[model samples]
Target: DLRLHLLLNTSVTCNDGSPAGYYLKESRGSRRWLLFLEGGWYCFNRENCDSRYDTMRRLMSSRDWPRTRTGTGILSSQPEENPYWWNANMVFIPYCSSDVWSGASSKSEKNEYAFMGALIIQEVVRELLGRGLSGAKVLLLAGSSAGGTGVLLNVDRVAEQLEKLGYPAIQVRGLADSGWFLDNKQYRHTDCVDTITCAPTEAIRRGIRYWNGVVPERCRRQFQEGEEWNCFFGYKVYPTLRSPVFVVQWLFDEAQLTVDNVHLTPVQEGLRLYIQNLGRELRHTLKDVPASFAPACLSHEIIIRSHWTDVQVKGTSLPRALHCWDRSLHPLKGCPVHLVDSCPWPHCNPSCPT
Candidate 1:
């Protein structure tokens, strides 16, 4: 039995005093990592289970890894695209899910579940460091869509929290996938309407719609020039941050949604601007980043996943056009991606559709 080596079972508090649960595992290795699931609110709360990975790891010894999500019990898959496998020298801390929230948090208050992603991240990082991986050479944090958003929002917070403990903030690495600056930015219908008023924005529902959530206020590129990234995700954070970051945008992601789809086309008009901003911030941070960090062939959804799958370690040589969303990302001529065609970004990966 794996007793949690963690202090008080870390929880993402809700105003209602309701609590969620999660399982923690430590690899007891040199280089460590923190894996934050987007929706820990559910996986930790209602979907009680040891670990989808623990089950799979035991199975991997006797059989092939489960590529699909085992129904009754999580046998390695909710998202077939971004699979989470624990690395030997890294600790994996999976959150419940994105939909699950504390409820006390809301967009109006900007206390929505978005920051919970960061909060859960704080818990995992503490738990890992508590075990003395404080000397760990590299600390990697990563996730999917809203999970990706979490990576961006929580990256700085994760770093800051680690610093108070007297560790190096420069050691952390974050990877986010298909994270729209604001949910469904490509799908903006109206700002005055209740469109931005919901969580698991229909897009999130595409993955799994179970809980209620809201958005957190963001101040990207909001830095004091050399301020060091206060929060690196979603904005140009070089001034307030120096940690390296990797981000991916799916070209085919549906551009229209119930909320803020209007800003999408407009935002799309300045796609290069936002891309450059994100890239510039990222370029300034993560060390050894290739000039072609942006991949044009794949959608925002898969670019980040690819990066995770292909990760070798902290000093791993950056690939040409590979991203964190889709390891299989590619650029097919005469196909769909127009942004890549118009932009100079290279499509240097094999798209992972299956």
Candidate 2:
């Protein structure tokens, strides 16, 4: 049995509708057990925004969706006209404007996406359990841009909680025309050492929300200084995520991640602006696992202008030599050595005198 069905009201009436918030729709015999829905940035009045919910209805209403609410989250073990009815279970989390969560009265909302999705899943699970149905086997589904980002970050956490409750499976079948970063800001993954896959945009957005209500003396400056509040910039949150992620970015994706203007220092060393914090995060999580760099490119490093190598910059120059560096300081990118492993970076790894 499944219990979440998120519908979207893509019309100008975003604030009012059946699909306005995260929804969980579940029913019996549904082999597929999860549906998480999401749309682009401005899905209501905008030209392409309508696709968010329209596409959802078409996709989830398939023959596999089921015809009645059954199992854990649904209102019943059976129903005759369950629109989302089918053998497949799903989770839907539509990304309405921050207004949807706070009614435009606050600094957006914390855990809007996560909380909404969790609420839907929780309700369905409860409903199902009451019916004597066992825990659910869920298949996660999310689409569009922000929707994609939501799924990427939340699905794993959702899966973790679900796992504790006996839902061992969460298959994330996502449609990330372009995915989002939890942090939203981004750095060119000079290599993975900066931070593998930490999207600064989402981070800053979250950060801004953290800075809410109170007006900072200098908005951007104060925000950057962390004298006020820190947003999503950190190397500590990655390891907390426990679910597997499957991502797809189109070659033509115009959405890009930006690097947040936060102080990025090494785990033990200070004043060094560089490297992805994955290793540090893993260490912090106390996972007791040695940090290893993957061959996959997903990080970047700062070109510390120094005389350590022949590379000198009258203004800007590239060096060549062995530099004592931590590999976990990079952001996710097309290359790997940039994050972990030792080398003179830039001229290292890919360009290391292999």
Candidate 3:
């Protein structure tokens, strides 16, 4: 039975003081586990957080969570839709704490909300240990959008935690979809007015302070006191991760463009240059990743889309690349998973949606 499973005995709560929880679809007798985190954009400061609580209450509180929910994309149970992970024990973790899954603070006298996204993940894993995760042979931590960024920040910690809990046999890996955000200059400079208009660096810096966010220890050590926000960028933290991770990013990521104040509907030479530079920087950053699928498309999250199987890079679908990545982990002779499009323009690949 797939239903909402609450963290009954934990201190971890959503922003509105509701218990944190996840939906589980058990695959009896299977040793594999796939935990997918849901994504929603975050609020960095008090004004944004307060406004988010009023309008996007569902994202900030679990008070009205559905009794049952269905999975899609990588979390899909349909073999035809998700061939590789259909039979795995699937756990879908919803995003209720809007810290980009990096928060560690609780409600205080001054602060009116709970920012415990990171703790929620830890508590979920701790709870899952009793419900078949202890016997898991493979645990793939995957997410999309903000959740995808969460995977990069938490995968290594999860692996280390599992080992410390005496479950070292379980191989923990990550699959981050559209979460490899760039810390580049905006096409148009604007003041930090709202979440959508704020610069990523400034947003994240403010977020870390407000959420009391925790980052990977190794990556955190690389930055100075005030530069801890850099760990949120995949390029900065990927090299420090001990656990293997597969990155899926769009060459012309629409979310990135949106925050950068770029409108490409009637593209100009300057916009074209910016888009091309984004692709080049993305390719360069992912050069040593070895397990990435970056298509030349103008889109955001993909792993959860209905057309997940339709997108391809270098003539190989994301599913195919992911399967190869799994095999590569076992030292098998597998096809390459580093499938980046060589094209410089958006929608260059015929597989990209119109």
Candidate 4:
């Protein structure tokens, strides 16, 4: 059974000062572990965060968390559904700090809520070491959406932490799903009425300052003092990551379209160009990445969805690509997992959902 385990001993609490926790499903004698972080969009400033606490408190506070959680998609315990990792130890960490899992600051006089997402990750890893993680042979740090971005930001740090904690033999890898967000200009510029409408660069800039965000040291050193927010983008930070990460992104990402104010139902000439440009840019950005799965689809966040296996790129399903990636880490020979759809238009791939 997947059971809730609170981080009772650590000082790293959620936004509402409630104890943070994760759901665990242990596989007896298993040496492989998969830690999946849940994703929700973040609040950038005080007004936004206050509103988030009022409406979507579940994302910010752990006070009302359920005692158990059912696993699905990558976390599925069934062998048929999750053929590669069905028997591996599964741990799901919920999103609570609203900083895209990058914040380091605690609640203080200036800030009413704590932003300890990064700290919570570190603490969780430490707690796991005492359980069965100390003897782990492989650890996959994976996430979806904001949590997927979290994987890019924290994968190396987790590996380093594991080494420092005396488990230097364990191989740490990352699987980031639907979090390769771009910082390009929107199709039609508009005022930042809300978070959804705000430009990605502007949102991240404000978020870094408010959250006192922490980034990978290698990436941080490359940016100037005020330009640290660039690390929030996958392309900007990918080169600096030491650990191997399998990126999962959709070419015509729906979230990116929403932010760019492109409505698909009423596609104009300019909008068609915009959609085509998005696919081109995504393809260009992912060209050099050795292990990635980018399908020419408009959906968002598929790795955790029920139909994840149905989506494919060049006849290779996501699960198959991921399995190949996992195998490539060892001496075993595996096929290259870089599978990006060549189609330029959205939903051009026959495997895409209607």
* After superposition, candidate 4 runs with Cα above 4 Å error: 192-197, 331-334
Score candidate 2 by lDDT: 0.31
Query: How would you encode candidate 3's per-residue C-alpha lDDT over 1-354 as one tens digit per residue?
Result: 368998976579999788999999998879999988889999888888889988999999989999888788887888788877888898989999999999999886877899998989998999999988998999999999999999999998899899899998999999999899989988889887877667989889988999999999989898967798999999999999999999999989988888778876577798888889989999899888899999999988988776699887777898889889888887444477888888999898999977
Listed per model in order, the count of residue pairs whose N, CA or C atoms clash below 3 Å is 48, 86, 0, 0
The local distance difference test score of each candidate is 0.38, 0.31, 0.89, 0.88
lDDT of 1 by residue, 1-354 (tens): 122222264345322212332334445643544444342222222222124324422211212312222111011223343344333233333343333221123223432222243344556566566565666765666565546666655566666767887886337766655553433243223233222333333423422222332222334334333222233235443233455556544333332122223223324545655443433333333323321233333333443333434422122212323232223231443222112222333232343233
| Model 2: per-residue Cα lDDT over 232-322, one tens digit each | 2122222333443333332112333123333323343331223334223222322231222211122321111122122222211121110
lDDT of 2 at 40: 38
Report lDDT (Cα) of residue 119, candidate 1: 49
Off by over 4 Å in 3: 193-196, 331-334
Q: After superposition, how far is residue 283 of candidate 3 from its true place, in Å?
A: 1.1
Cα-based lDDT at residue 140, candidate 4: 95
TM-score for all models, in order of appearance: 0.49, 0.36, 0.97, 0.96
When sorted by TM-score, best at the front, the candidate numbers are: 3, 4, 1, 2
Model 1 quality (TM-score):
0.49
